[PDB]
Structures are given as C-alpha cells and as structure tokens.
Amino acid sequence: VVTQPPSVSAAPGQKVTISCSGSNSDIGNNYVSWYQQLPGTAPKLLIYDNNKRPSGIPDRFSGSKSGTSATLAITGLQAGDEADYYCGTWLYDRAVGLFGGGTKVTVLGQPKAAPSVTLFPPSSEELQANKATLVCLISDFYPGAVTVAWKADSSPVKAGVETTTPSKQSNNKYAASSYLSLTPEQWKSHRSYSCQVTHEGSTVEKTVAP
C-alpha cells in the first residue's frame, strides 16, 4: 500500500503539500502521476512523469519525487482546489497499477453562510395516488451541519421524517434535504406543516398548508 495523509488543510492563497509514501518496488523504481477528483466528478490528470503537466493544467500545481516518496504541491490555494487528490503509479516490471489512499484538501477560513430553505407541499398528482410528501430543500450553508425538525401545525412530528447527511456543492457550500411522509388524510387534518432548519444557533422556518 502507498500511504497518503487522509486530510490536508491551509488558508486561501498559501501553499499545501500532498505526500505519497511507498517502497522501492512501487514509487521508488517507477513514475508517479497525480489525480484530482472534485465531488461528483470523474478523476482528472494533474501531473504526469513525476513533474510534467498536461495542457490546461495551471502552473500552481507541481510534482516531485525522492526515492520511495512523491509530493504534490499547491501554491495560491484557491476555493476551487477543494478536492480529493490521488497519487498513482505503474509497476513497469509486474505490469500493475497502484493508487495511494488519497488526500482531501480543505481550505480554511471559509465564511459562515445561512441556509436557503424551500418547502414544497404534496403535488395533487401525488395526493391522487393516496400518498403525500413534504419536500424541504436546504442549500448554500456553511459549515456543513444543520439540524431539521418538523412540526404539524405547532406540534413536533418525529415519525415519517427522512433527512440526508449534508453534501458538498460545487460552490464549496453545503446542501441537505428532509422529507416528511404523510397520508393525504393527515396532511388535510392539520392546518399547516413546518420544516425548521437550525444552523449556528439560528433557525430558518418554512410553512405549507392544504
């Protein structure tokens, strides 16, 4: 196994360094290449031939090798560099490929962001199939942690609630969604339903009525 540090962090504009630790049979005797994987994207070639760069790759990314150990370096660390980075080798003798564990790059000092909340009531077409779903969509929040509580009128509803884990968006902000499953009867029985989203001690609440 080729070892990489699991996490690496620095503020915007400074230098970060990703290590790739191996042995003589893997990194030692062969060429190391570097790969970038943004969340939800396929990996992308950053560095080939220990230090060379393909067309389109900015000069802020550089590579180095010293025996059994290789290193990727990022200078002028931007917001758009927040990704997963892998070192990869080809064992020429054995004809086998090997990737390091991967390193997550987190950019420090990102500003706090209040969540944007949209709540949708059941569609009449969904109600006609004798089922109801309330859709609470949460986006553009930072840090990536929210608490969701649902209410029927003003009473707490715990049953029939499914919330996702927060997910990272393309703008380095986070998103999550919560769903409240009801019967058309329960939906009509109450005068309103609320989705309450708490983040950094402050709550953003949305309401829907039949």
Added chain:
Amino acid sequence: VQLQESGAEVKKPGSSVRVSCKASGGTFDSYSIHWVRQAPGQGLEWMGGIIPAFGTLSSAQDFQARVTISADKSTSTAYMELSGLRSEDTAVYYCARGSFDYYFWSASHPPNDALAIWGQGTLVTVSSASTKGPSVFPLAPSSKSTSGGTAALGCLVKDYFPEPVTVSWNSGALTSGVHTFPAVLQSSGLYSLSSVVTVPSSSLGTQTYICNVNHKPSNTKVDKRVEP
C-alpha cells in the same frame, strides 16, 4: 476525446457484470485502456489494463481470477467483466485512456504513460433487491417558493432502486440555477431525490418547464411538465 461507458445496473450476488467502454470522437489507436473502481466514499482502485492494439492485458492480484479484460479493435469498445459479484463489489467502475502511443514503445525504456482521459463511471450496485423505476411528481412554483424576482420550481423523483438518477431541464437547454439534490434512502430500501430550478418569476405563465429524469438501471426516462 470521450469514453462512453454502459449504464448503471443492479446485479444479484454471485452474478457477473460486463461494463462497456466506447471511445467517441477518437479511437483506441495504440493507447492503453484501464479499469479503475471506486466504492462509495472510498479511494480509487486499479483493476486491470489492456493495450487494444496488441491484445496484451493485465489485472490486479485481487481480481486476476474474477476479471476478464477484453477489447474490440474496430469497433473501439473495451470490456471489463467481473464475476462472483458480492456486496463489496458495489462501486463506480471507471474506464480510462492512457496518453502514451505504444507504437513508439521500446520495452527497455518504461513509458511516461498516465490516465489522461476518463469515462464518467458506471455505478454497479450488487444487491439481491430488485430494480424499481421512479415515480416523478411536479413541484409547482407558488408565492411560497418565490423570491422576488426569482422563483423556485422542481421535480420529485420518488421510490427508485438502485442509484443513480440524473435530472436535466428543458432537454439540457436550461442549466442556470439548476440544483439537483443528492437522494435520501428510505427504510423501505428505496431512494428519493429532488431537482429544483430558480427561474425569473415573470416567465411562469409564458415558459414551459420540463424536468428530464433518467433512471438508467430501469431504462426509464420521465419528461415531467411543471406548470403553475
């Protein structure tokens, strides 16, 4: 220029999968083709490689007896078949094309080959749970979804298995303000997700909005009209 992979699928434990890798806007020529897998939330794992021009292949020790790596010269399609599938074989299967032209290769000189071009990946889900197409419901814009100015409208993609589901709007012409949210997994074992689009409030009576929901494991496409 691109590597077009076969669609996502559920596969029963003990069964075998064959993932296709079709080159579009370019042919295999004398470049290498590699299969790399990624289990959800995990690292990249090299499985095997082939130089289609030679028919010469190799596979990782951990896959040697279960992987069959092949390639068709003309057409330019490469295949990876993995047998005795297990729950731990659930992963996104990528195919990638090397930068080096092996016509110029001298075996006494290792080449500076690297994974230059990648496919989008096909998520193979190994499960004994059977496939289910989604139920798509419109999420109508109202005064409770309006912010000026702009207005949020969407689609609800309910009860599907397995992942993934892709959503585009207006056949790909509407890309600005589109936010497709990651799916929730219900206790039923079925997933649901939502796709929203933030549009100008003034165009709600004049512009047609259709979300295009793709569920490749069930070969379903729902083009759902979102009206006010």
